Design a protein around this ligand. Structure first.
Ligand code: HEM
Ligand SMILES: Cc1cccc(Cl)c1
Length: 431
């Protein structure tokens, strides 16, 4: 049978993500009662909900079977779950397809492979170590402002959002003065279905509002990054913006400007917001588990284990979709050619078959098997930079904190996609 209506809506509708408790309960009910079923929500394509850790890996490691962008028919699958009216808007705007960015999530092999190889080396851990000092200096300046601002704040908008964005913008070689513009467009981009993040230039109540907001935000990013691409092509620098802007194909021709824009959009949004969310979720967890803060201050070598458990628990990238290019049997279910799948990375990270007491914050999981960065050739290119940023920040921050207290109501971004806290009122005790 189809998944029960209210379980399916809890996970498919952005509104279903506004509170973590009933969302994660719907996850768990599927893992325990219907681990691979089809959600048939009004206004949405039918979706296989991939709730199980083993199934996430099985799908992600077979891109010849489970495409992101629809394989040879490029843009016939939207790798980010829009509603039907939204996908219809995009096909109207683009002329019959959904490939609204040339960013990695929209690509299939072998194009995905060729484009990813532009930055693969740049993002490897050994190649990121040359940035560690500059990242640590950014952390220290952010912590200086935290300590100066006093102990009562919103740990998200008044702290956690700034460090990750300044790291990315510094790696682009883009001036600090442009950070507020990038922050605002990031909000427009991940807030397409959040009630407090509606753009002034879109009809908020239209059945395709989210898709119109996604398109409008991309057009604003294109305008900004066109100036950057042209600038770095004309005057190359030792920065990430240059690597992206000057990239050439096997024929010695520039990649089309949209491939640079796609990298720039991905790194200027998902390249910092996910970091911000994990750092804020980590502080929220330290408030609930003061003994963990004590322990990590006593043994700073525990910080990477803290990072890994915060990544598992927060899992701020909730899903990507795939399309079956052929019939495929998994967990006694018959997935048909053309069926879409919704990969639930947060659910995989609470799979009791993999994690003992999966809802418990436990930094002593060694190894911490989390799939917060996904899997397969699309596995997060920025995983090493995310682990480095979070390690460096916590190394510099945690000595300064004796206690975190949540003093007010946490608020999550209302999204089925890239979510996490937008507000965490705290009272900090400093050492
Ligand atoms: C806590 C931080 C982060 C988390 C949890 C996270 C999680 C994810 C996940 C789940 C995906 C999808 C993987 C899949 O399809 O199987 C992804 C993709 C990606 N992430 Fe991250 N990410 C983080 C940080 C970053 C950073 C810092 C950057 C870059 C500076 C980055 C760049 C990307 C890009 C470009 C993609 C698309 C990869 C592809 O489709 O091949 N991410 N991330
Ligand atoms: C999570 C994620 C990764 C890359 C691009 C986007 Cl829009 C979002």
């Amino acid at each position: 049978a189809a998944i029960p209506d209210e379980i399916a809506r809890q996970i498919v509708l952005p509104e279903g993500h506004k509170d973590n408790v009933p969302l994660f309960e719907a996850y768990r009910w599927l893992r325990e009662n219907q681990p691979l079923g089809q959600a048939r929500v009004e206004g949405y394509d039918p979706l296989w909900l991939i709730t199980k850790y083993a199934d996430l890996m099985e799908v992600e490691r077979q891109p010849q079977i489970f495409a992101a962008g629809g394989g040879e028919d490029k843009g016939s699958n939207n790798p980010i779950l829009a509603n039907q009216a939204g996908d219809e808007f995009t096909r109207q705007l683009l002329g019959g397809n959904l490939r609204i960015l040339d960013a990695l999530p929209y690509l299939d092999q072998p194009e995905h492979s060729v484009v990813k190889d532009v930055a693969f080396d740049w993002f490897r851990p050994a190649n990121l170590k040359k940035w560690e000092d500059r990242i640590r200096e950014t952390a220290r300046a952010s912590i200086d402002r935290l300590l100066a601002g006093g102990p009562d704040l919103d740990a998200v908008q008044e702290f956690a959002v700034f460090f990750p964005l300044r790291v990315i913008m510094s790696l682009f070689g883009v001036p600090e003065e442009d950070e507020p513009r990038m922050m605002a467009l990031t909000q427009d981009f991940f807030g397409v279905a959040d009630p407090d993040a509606q753009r002034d230039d879109i009809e908020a109540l239209s059945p395709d509002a989210a898709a119109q907001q996604w398109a409008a935000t991309i057009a604003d990013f294109y305008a900004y990054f066109d100036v950057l691409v042209e600038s770095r092509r004309a005057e190359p620098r030792d920065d990430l913006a240059t690597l992206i802007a000057v990239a050439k194909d096997e024929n010695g021709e520039y990649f089309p400007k949209t491939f640079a824009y796609g990298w720039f959009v991905a790194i200027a949004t998902a390249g910092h917001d996910t970091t911000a969310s994990t750092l804020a979720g980590c502080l929220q967890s330290l408030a609930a588990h003061p003994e963990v803060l004590d322990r990590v201050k006593g043994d700073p070598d525990l910080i990477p284990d803290l990072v890994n458990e915060s990544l598992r628990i927060v899992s701020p990238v909730k899903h990507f979709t795939r399309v079956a290019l052929q019939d495929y049997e998994m967990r006694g279910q018959k997935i048909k050619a053309g069926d879409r799948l919704m990969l639930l990375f947060q659910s995989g990270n609470r799979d009791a078959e993999v994690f003992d007491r999966p809802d418990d914050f436990d930094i002593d999981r060694r190894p911490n098997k989390h799939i917060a960065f996904g899997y397969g050739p699309h596995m997060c290119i920025g995983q090493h930079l995310a682990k480095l940023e979070l390690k460096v920040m916590l190394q510099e921050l945690l000595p300064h904190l004796e206690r975190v207290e949540v003093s007010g109501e946490p608020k999550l971004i209302q999204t089925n996609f890239v979510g996490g806290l937008r507000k965490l009122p705290v009272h900090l005790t400093f050492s």
